[model samples]
Target: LPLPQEAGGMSELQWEQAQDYLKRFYLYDSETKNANSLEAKLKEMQKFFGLPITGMLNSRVIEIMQKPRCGVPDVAEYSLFPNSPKWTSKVVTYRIVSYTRDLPHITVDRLVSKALNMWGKEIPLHFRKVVWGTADIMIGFARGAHGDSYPFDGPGNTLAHAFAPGTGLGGDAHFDEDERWTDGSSLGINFLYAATHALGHSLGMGHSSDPNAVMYPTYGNGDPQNFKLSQDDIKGIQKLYGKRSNSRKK
Candidate 1:
């Protein structure tokens, strides 16, 4: 870990916030009253921060924790899509399919449907679960050198990717299970979080320039509270779906 020397030092409140953020990922039990337990937690934090596991606070450790953590953009604030076209009043349904043979049959299917449902709620569309071979959109977990040109990068670098809307390979999404996928725990990246972002791409949205937009390319490791769809995203979708009859027409 390295320290940012310009600001002299962080305040007590800032240090507490950093520690809280780290605890989210490290799974430290804050309710415990044992000092030894606290010391052990500090060592784990040190290891994650790439600092010497000496159970001591230093400038370098503070610097690493202070850096941005949450990478997903907050698109809910800005209007990314102003006049996008709306989907026709046709019943659009997609059959979810699995691509990775190694993934557990049940978990893969569950995640595929979960991802589809996430977008289905946002867009005026329906989805149907289908067998492995035939599906409108394929969803599953895979590793490096999977059939596509965009191979998985083992772990952290690239969490997951989705193809743009089109035919064939289009509308397909892959999750890097190599990254821990969980809902309650904070060990690895939350699958639902990234799935929501990828689904946005499947619906013809591109990476947003604004860091607050869900379409943003880089996922900043910040507080999960910062992850949201910007106003731009809403406007973009409305452009495709037309103004909600009740809301103000753009």
Candidate 2:
């Protein structure tokens, strides 16, 4: 990967902070302990945001954290299980292992399924709802350290997270039940909006730098019922699994 030149300057303190952000977000590795190792992490991050990979404490790197993003590391984008296994099958199965209690049981079901359906429309991927039996995608709500190494920070902060596609916990999506999830925007976190973004990762797509894309780190509220995928979003998933029959022609 080509590293881009720094666009903005950063103070030494700011520089260390940037390194911390990268490390915290799983971008930087402490074990490397070598010259340009931090630079390498910064470069990986730049690739993630489609920004210049200069590796310097550039303005772009500092601004990257300001953007809202997914909780899981971009590791999902570059790293994966053997053979990639980016879902060989077209038909996918999902189950609401639990509900948020923020909405009616039926309403919650609709939101989760609809969110997954959005990506289903962009690729050959198809999602099937399951009430019992095994499911490929598990959904639910939880609080701090509900299990897994990742824990929630009660209300706000980290909204939700999902495992990248594969076996075991792979494709499982979870929400922070601490927050007030809603069907409409503005009142609180919108279930569909958050789910749509989370499902992208569960489906194997990572965050996009494009603010317009639902996969962008930052959250935006709009009508989920009439939600449309940005070109960036379409490309992200389509690139991963090929385009769907209903997808716009490239």
Candidate 3:
């Protein structure tokens, strides 16, 4: 039972790549060197991706590995942001430090604001945009080997990443400029879709197990124009920030 049970069709390259992908997103510790650890890791990946818990390197698992996804780890290494990593203030500010070459600055600005508003409509928080100085959540586009430890891998695979709520790097969302960000529901990745998801992390939301959730790690197959936060997404955000309330919390 140590080896993957139904790992016949998977090649050596695929197996190693799967291991690397698991290590990055699924938090597989290769250093464990434990016999059954790979099996367990596969099961965990399967569970997260909503696949059958076969604990095997099957076709489905390999296919999902190649899908464009968020750079955030599924099983975060530590307990993040003191408690549950959320903004203390009712009004959260953001600054767009950089823009992607794919879309116009105006289009990018509009889309990013639209993404933030998607959450703002549900929660009692106000998201303000600042032109100068450091804001609470800083939005930017960068290529490979940017400032952070998690660098973008050229084009596909990882679209963007964000830090959980806190200070400094906290609440900052970084998009991989390597990916062809788009406004239309076309070939390239949707800026609004990715922005909304990244902003979820900025607001201290983790990857939702629910596939329909806005916080889901993988990119959705449907049209980004038809995007709307699911009930699961609303519930999770409200649990953190509460519903759209008239009275302020003190």
Candidate 4:
């Protein structure tokens, strides 16, 4: 049975898009529509986003889906100091690898770079793409019971997860196989919104209590087009990476 039996007022196009996104994260099928399936899916979704697993879809879950996507730009130009004291500076390069069985019509790598750039713009560090294994940050889209301690739900619920900054798994990120990611118009939220939030954690930021903050533990509905870093977020990163320079290199 399908995880989201109701589809929650999603249109056919939206449903298809959600299915596609979930496939990327490695969540697809359910044996039957039963309490087990519902509970399992909910737990998996919750775990993916570092939230406590509760079978019920409450205000928090609704809020997460309502949060707006970030307008992170693609192909950002910057530099990194390998020896810098800032935590992010040590990891100069990152990569987004495709692990899903089927590839989407749109590429997530470009979106990821854009999300990275959003943070880069606020901080003094720089990041670039590296060949596969050489990258310090590795983003993976996987499904049910992947390599990490966490696993994916059959469908619905949580959409993604990322590690806190440090080393090894510190910069790695993952999207749940059960979610459908999209850039088009739909009732549900876009993957970019969640990805940007997870990326923030990968860069050493914690969940912000403020629903308006990107670091907020729970998502909230807002204008998707104008999503930007909050003053607190800017100041926090600046404290770590130093302020951005006013002059551009000639």
Candidate that scores best on lDDT: 3
Top TM-score model: 3
In model 1, what is the error at residue 160, expressed in angstroms?
1.4
In what order do the candidates fall by TM-score, top score first?
3, 2, 4, 1
**Could you tell me every candidate's TM-score relative to the true structure?**
0.51, 0.74, 0.83, 0.57
Question: What value of lDDT does candidate 1 attain over all alpha carbons?
Answer: 0.52
Which ranges of candidate 4 are over 4 A from the true structure? 1-91, 99-106, 131-133, 185-187, 243-250
Residue pairs clashing in model 3 are: none
Tens-place lDDT per residue, model 3, 1-250, is 1324345665688667767777787554668455577787677776666556477665657666766777777655554544556666768787787787778888887888888888888888777777777887777888657767765688777777777776566667788888888876466877888788878777776666566767665565765456877667777768657754232111
Give the per-residue lDDT digits (tens) of candidate 2, residues 81-126. 6246456665788877777656877787788778788788877767
Instruction: Name the better of 3 and 4 by lDDT.
Output: 3
Clashes of 4: 19
Candidate 1 vs 2: which has more lDDT: 2
Q: Mind sharing the TM-score for model 1?
A: 0.51
Better by TM-score, candidate 2 or 1: 2
